[PDB]
Amino acid sequence: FVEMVDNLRGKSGQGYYVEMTVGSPPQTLNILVDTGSSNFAVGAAPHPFLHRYYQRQLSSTYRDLRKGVYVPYTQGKWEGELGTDLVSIPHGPNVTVRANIAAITESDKFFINGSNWEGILGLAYAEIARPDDSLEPFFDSLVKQTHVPNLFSLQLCGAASVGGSMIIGGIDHSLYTGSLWYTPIRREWYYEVIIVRVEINGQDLKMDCKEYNYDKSIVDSGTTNLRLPKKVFEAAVKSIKAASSTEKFPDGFWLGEQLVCWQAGTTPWNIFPVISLYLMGEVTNQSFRITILPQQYLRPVEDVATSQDDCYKFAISQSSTGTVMGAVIMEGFYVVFDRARKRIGFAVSACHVHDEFRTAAVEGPFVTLDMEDCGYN
Ligand SMILES: COc1cccc(-c2cccc(CCc3cccc(N)n3)c2)c1
């Protein structure tokens, strides 16, 4: 696994990518690591933002599936042609696999101007694969065709340029301190989990916990923010705003509609409280909690040419589709996607940003009753 350490790169707000090769001879591409989707989709045409794209005509091992795929988002989409081909990960396990690949032939507001990735690796399960769950995800193909154990782990560091590790098939104990604590994957579609309690600064929100997971809570390397359902976001902001009334910021800030700036080196960490999410544990009536800092939910915006300050965007936002524990959360922790035992492990990341005051934490066990009632059906 030492070969796989530091195999991720990125830029803030723009995601974490791994090098992959597709076809024979190998074409190298940088591929976004996304635990919130289930298609391996890659640029296959010369869109002007792209450094590189998959040239199927150059590959002897390419096979057409003669079926297209169309994938909408709110504002934007990608569309493509399905096929299979041989896929490796240079700084991953020493194997080659025949995987489905969606050759992206048209898109809108998908690729990012200035980004250094050309595709997406969906690491979630077949249920949310498009056009349907019969299209086998990459990781399912990998596990099926090789002896790679059915698990992967992610250390997203952030740390301008960002970095991290994706350990495929195992865990590397150099990437975390203390103990791993595991929360069950409620259902294998997204990496769905259950949050059972939330504390801002130690003090809890006292909401029907069911709300915390209305209609989902998921772990998602492809979302920057900690996203929260309307009503939980509402309550959540209310307490953070209160926690932090010392200084003042507009209403738009909290809605992610304006940025906040303080002069270089002048940011007040401590007027902002820590956020603790209690996750369902492995055992009845037993939970654990992960604790993140404002340096996680207060994210720098790289360069604004209309300012000189240290400008941050408030990284919590509301959702119609549930809680999303994005890079804000994951950058605090080493996260183990233990597919084989249907559980996600969290430990303090050896690379998370800390000081000599407060620190990211994973703590347990706690006693929490009625954890099953926290899940929405
Ligand atoms: C931290 O990961 C990021 C940050 C910004 C943008 C993306 C990004 C951009 C275009 C496409 C995708 C993959 C599709 C997608 C959309 C929404 C949510 C998820 N998980 N995946 C990601 C990922």
CA 258 to centroid of chain Cα atoms: 24
The rounded Cα 175 to chain-centroid distance in angstroms is 17
Paired tokens of 287: 């939970």
Contact 36 CB / ligand 1 (< 6 Å): yes
Instruction: Please answer whether residues 18 and 156 qualify as being in contact, where contact means their C-beta atoms are separated by less than 8 angstroms.
Output: no
Tokens of 226: 């900690």
CB-based burial label for 225 (10 Å; 0-12, 13-18, 19+) = buried
Confirm or reject: Cβ of 120 under 6 Å from ligand 1: yes
Contacts of residue 109, Cβ cutoff 8 Å, sequence gap at least 6? 73, 75, 76, 77
Q: Which of the listed residues 223, 225, 302, 313 should we mutate to test ligand 1's pocket, taking the one with most ligand atoms within 8 A of CB?
A: 223
The answer to whether the CB of 273 falls within 8 A of the CB of 325 is no
Helical ranges in 193-338 per DSSP H: 230-243, 251-254, 294-297, 327-330
Active site residue 220: yes
Paired with 317 in beta bridges are 227
The residues near 333 (Cβ < 8 Å, ≥ 6 apart) are 176, 290, 346, 347, 348, 349, 352, 360, 362
**If you measure from the C-alpha of residue 34 to the centroid of ligand 1, how many angstroms do you get, rounded to a whole number?**
7
Pairing type for strands 298-300 and 310-314 reads: antiparallel
CA 179 and chain centroid, separation? 21
Q: Is the CB of 226 under 6 A from ligand 1?
A: no
Ligand 1 centroid – CA 35 distance (Å):
10
User: What sections of 97-170 are H helices per DSSP?
Assistant: 138-145
| Entry field: residues in the chain | 377
- Structural domains present in the chain: 16-148 (2.40.70.10), 149-377 (2.40.70.10)
Give the resolution value in Å.
Answer: 2.1
Pick the residue whose CA is nearest to atom 9 on ligand 1: 110
Task: Report the candidate in 243, 240, 329, 259 with the shortest Cα–Cα distance to residue 301.
Answer: 259
Burial 44-58 (b: 16+ CB within 10 A, else e): beebeebebbbebee
Residue 34 catalytic? Answer: yes
**Under a CB-based contact definition with an 8 Å cutoff, are residues 271 and 244 in contact?**
yes
Closest to 321 (Cα-Cα) out of 228, 234, 236, 241: 228
Ligand 1 and 220: CB distance under 6 A = yes
